[PDB]
Symmetry: C3
Subunit: 169 residues, 3 copies
């Protein structure tokens, strides 16, 4: 949403400059861009941005896609915490069974190439490496350029910057 680029303060010019440029590249198609932009935004917790990018991510994302990217955010929210947490315990709990349900990572709808990538984005924002890494893997395998994956990280990072600046005014 352009009203979103317009809401950014003047001491956060860079973020604006980075938002209009990331939100209109090409390296990623539309479903991969807006899909990541949507996932990242719900992950910032700033509803302003989620409402805006989402409104824009309707003329690009499919009905299933929207739910997908939002599901990714939902489920990485739990996992990013779990795995990073276990990871900090020197493997001392790797034996138990997490029990956490997550049939959705099997994507329950939409291509994994995209699901997986949006999960990357979210993991980048939440700060969980044991997840950021495996998704870069699951991706790299199914394909996806090293360029596309990087741009997504750039997307997560820029969405996070917008959230912060809009949350300072």
């Amino acid at each position: 949403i352009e009203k979103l680029k317009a809401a950014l303060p003047e001491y956060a010019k860079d973020i604006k400059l980075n938002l209009s440029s990331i939100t209109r590249s090409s390296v990623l198609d539309q479903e991969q861009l807006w899909g990541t932009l949507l996932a990242s935004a719900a992950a910032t917790r700033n509803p302003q941005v989620l409402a805006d990018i989402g409104a824009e991510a309707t003329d690009h994302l499919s009905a299933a896609a929207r739910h997908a990217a939002l599901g990714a955010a939902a489920i990485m929210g739990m996992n990013n915490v779990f795995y990073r947490g276990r990871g900090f315990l020197e493997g001392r709990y790797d034996d138990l069974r997490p029990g956490l349900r997550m049939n959705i990572i099997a994507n329950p709808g939409i291509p994994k190439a995209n699901f997986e990538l949006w999960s990357f984005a979210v993991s980048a924002i939440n700060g969980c490496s044991q997840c950021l890494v495996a998704h870069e893997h699951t991706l790299r395998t199914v394909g996806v350029d090293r360029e596309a994956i990087f741009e997504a990280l750039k997307a997560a990072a820029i969405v996070s910057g917008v959230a912060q600046a809009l949350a300072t005014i």
Copy 2:
């Protein structure tokens, strides 16, 4: 708790099933099962979520209990930053008095245990290993199990997933 479940969308079923399972569970002291779901929901920072795990906790915890829980998140919000922080600085700050009071550490009511428990929980939501390890090494001393610390982590992670799941819908309309 049961109310909050009809909230999540069709795209977050896992979270739902996940939420009814962690509480339906019985791996730890019912108390340990709420000041952890509480301190944790408080850690998430979602107002809606903190309210529900606020309702079913109304004496589901021992009054001074909530104080300990909610006090765990509050004091950890400080600690998880300072310590994670000092831990990134190559140890060039390991000898400076972090004149930060945290006396609540000598927990109020609740015996100095479940504190380190939901404390541990909170540390997970915030991502501070430095703390997460100490509260675990200590928890594994006051005779606290391990399936229970694990159970706590599952709890911490699930509420966050519930937080994220909710906050997205709570905004869009």
Copy 3:
């Protein structure tokens, strides 16, 4: 300050003494302690805290300064995520070219040795080791004392504790 200290609960007793203690600081400046305080509040994302600190802020800080601390939080918000993610990938992308504009960092408007203190404090709140370490290195290079940097870290953690503490009350009841 005072108005914010009284809004906090009883159990958050330790944070109180902390914000109160961090407030009447000598270690850092008026501009320093306050851009940090201001940038940290913005970083905790808590509306109320940004407001109380801002209100008091625009009193010890110049417009160019208040804007700088807010720009730091905004820009670190982008950078703390990118750099952290790239480090998680183990340099396997360390030179793919970020292509992310900054410069607010090159020239923030006010003296760097203050903008850096502010970016540092925010990187501690977001938890980016790559950034904290860079900004901490930079700081020493330009003359700031580790006591001062240590003071900024504390500020950030204490402010964080405030946000967390005030957040729960604001939610429940």
